[PDB]
Symmetry: C3
Subunit: 340 residues, 3 copies
């Protein structure tokens, strides 16, 4: 909701309150999504100022407040800043911003990241180029300088981030994306590679000095119809855990397939059908193991642009024999979301 | 302060800056409320959208930022999300919301929760039904479906919350409240019971598999006069600590009495008189021990609807011989509050 | 940006998104400011209500969200409440507020606290009177009761804060400031003394029972010209660390000199020249050691009141022979800031 707009500068203060609950058998420790209260809220602001006819300055910040914690010691569990950056758009030259933003390879994965609750399984956070990462400089260009309609590209530099964890770290890397959209249709290609930190190489799982992520997307968006499919692979980038030996690291190689089919009825119902399978290859010792595998049936009902509720149901195609210990149970999510 | 209102959707962004200080002798470790800076701030939003003539969608989030911490390691001590839920009101059918919200039994305790600073002693957080808890589904009904004026009831389901602490945990339980208000007068009854988690039963203090909380309230509200009294009891629900043996758990049985008398002068002074006594029964070993006991004299002065200051003074009726080690000293609170 | 203004009460919701990066050689552990992503955001609110013709109530809260953390365990590193207080202004009597606010001695140091990124080195947080501290009652007076133009003073009481750290603690103390400004010119004097806590005296570095901080400032502000100089000293107040023996405490005595020269060009460039030197005296064992010493060359470019970027470059005058281990390398900062 735009709360301010004077002197060529408008500030949009958005957010939302999401009452959420997960339903799975047992404690939910062996299920796909877990079990129990998952309530949370959002807050943030999109700022945009017109420096002049061609020049636009902008900034954004988005935080995540968990609502399923107590007010005691664990009050903080789950809270974090999701986005935080600032930049400039210029005429038909393109735009540039820096801070914590999405990785270029998400330009592709975004296509199937549409499910009511789950989905977008291969878009991990702080995982190089496939999700939200810190310290990325992103240049983007629309309509190839205004010369070609529907043709966009983007180049991105990922600063070295040597954190405490192997999972949340990353060396220096570059990446890019070319996407063309023409009348309901869109095709996207994204790729990126980066140095792995010492702590990352020192891990038992995963072998190499270089991380790679590429994904291509194809979608038809129009007429209340949303059809999208994603295919991508990774080298020493997807984080995995062997729950049996308590080993941590990265999967030498992964192949990812996301499929989504949704329809928006006029009275406000939007049923969703999705399939996701992410298999890892050459997992030292295990060999080939499925990390994610399921069919998704769900629907979101929009009372309007502010209110809505949804049921998201994951039919877990992982079996109890999973070599890494990936949960094999189903998970149903029920949500009731207000937002401004 | 309502910062937005367009298209049947209004967003209220509220909050406040409370400069606060506690005065007690010694460290304040043996006093009622402690001693030293207690400054803090609030932020939150009430969102409400009219889906149509009968249907209203709403959401809310409320956070607590402590201001008495340094900017070092302890920056986070005390911060937490207080509220976070979303729901729907429908015609004369009633309303329903889910998330972190107040427990039904607070419908009663709310009556005496009026003091300038302290009071509301038996409305603990994350304590089943008597305070703010996570993962509660609440159905409420006004004027018995619009058929009877001033007659409201509410049923509430409390989801299982197995946290790290015994104090902040809780099993599954149901609860409700019937309140009738007729012309300055109000009578309320609330009750709820829930399963105790294993960690809770594994505690040294408290014995049982079931937790119970009920409280009834009676109030006269009108003519600048506020008179209210609450009486309630609990089974294995009120959290207690034996400061001597460092034992923790719950009081098998408690009896609670809250009394409040306030008057609102026209020039903006509102003197407050209150009495609170909460005694525990059958405390394994100790027997009968007072958890809370004091007389309260205080006054809030409202410069207007945005500004105000207050002095709250607790005359602690607990003696130095308390078997559990409950502080026995007095505490005076001085506050200066801005809010929007 | 003022988002609300009705009934004599206006609420200003401000904030900013700062994409930031530090450039220094090596792991940035031996440099002046460090090395790597330094992105962060701000949020806060200034509230002001007119109780009447002479009376104004106000409140403020300002938080700091770091953007260079991951969304994992370290999500919280760096976040904190910077400001949180409320108060009243009255006619020509003066103003009074309480909470977490700036220390009086900052009234002086503020003069040179102007650099694009760094600078203001001797204005530490939670360090008695020279920076933001918790539990301070501040009385301020403008134009000596409206009797003398440009003559302001302020008296401040600092409540005892016995935290976990020696660095973040402080006993009871008083302080004040007299500043006179007449047509482009300003002269300021500030002083304060406070009791040191036991934990503070129990430290290896620093000796005494009393902490003292005084600083005087002289500035010319007008005509796009900003010239300012600060000189101050301290007794057992400036926190120092011996990186060799891993000793912590306070410098018995320090002498501080800040010099800043800036010019605001009309097209939006503001070049900045600054010199800072803070030397400690009588450091048990070491003797005289420089804590801070550098020349600063930088410039901020303002696209307008909302957008801007800057390069801040510190030419570190500390040498590799520093007896305390103070970083000796240079640091360049590049920033792109949106704000509302």
């Amino acid at each position: 909701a735009e709360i301010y707009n004077k002197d060529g500068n408008k500030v949009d203060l958005y957010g939302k309150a999401v009452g959420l609950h997960y339903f799975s058998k047992g404690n939910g420790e062996n299920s796909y999504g877990g079990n129990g209260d998952m309530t949370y809220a959002r807050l943030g602001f999109k700022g945009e100022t017109q420096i002049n006819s061609d020049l636009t300055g902008y900034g954004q910040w988005e935080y995540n407040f968990q609502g399923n914690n107590s007010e005691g010691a664990d009050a903080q569990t789950g809270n974090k800043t999701r986005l935080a950056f600032a930049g400039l758009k210029y005429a038909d030259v393109g735009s540039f911003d820096y801070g914590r933003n999405y990785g270029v390879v998400y330009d592709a994965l975004g296509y199937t990241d549409m499910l009511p609750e789950f989905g977008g399984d291969t878009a991990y956070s702080d995982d190089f180029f496939v999700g939200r990462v810190g310290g990325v400089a992103t240049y983007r260009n629309s309509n190839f300088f205004g010369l070609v309609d529907g043709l966009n590209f983007a180049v991105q530099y990922l600063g070295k981030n040597e954190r405490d964890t192997a999972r949340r770290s990353n060396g220096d890397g570059v990446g890019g994306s070319i996407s063309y959209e023409y009348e309901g249709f869109g095709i996207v290609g994204a790729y990126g590679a980066a140095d792995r930190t010492n702590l990352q190489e020192a891990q038992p799982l995963g072998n190499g000095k270089k991380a790679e992520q590429w994904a291509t997307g194809l979608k038809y968006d129009a007429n209340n119809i949303y059809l999208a499919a994603n295919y991508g692979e990774t080298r020493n980038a997807t984080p995995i855990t062997n729950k049996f030996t308590n080993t941590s690291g990265f999967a030498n190689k992964t192949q990812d397939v996301l499929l989504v089919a949704q329809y928006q009825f006029d009275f406000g119902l939007r049923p969703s059908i999705a399939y996701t399978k992410s298999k890892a290859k050459d997992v030292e010792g295990i060999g080939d193991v499925d990390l994610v595998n399921y069919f998704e049936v769900g629907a979101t009902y929009y009372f309007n642009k502010n209110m809505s509720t949804y049921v998201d149901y994951i039919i877990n195609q992982i079996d109890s024999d999973n070599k890494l210990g990936v949960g094999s149970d189903d998970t149903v999510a029920v949500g009731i979301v207000y937002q401004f």
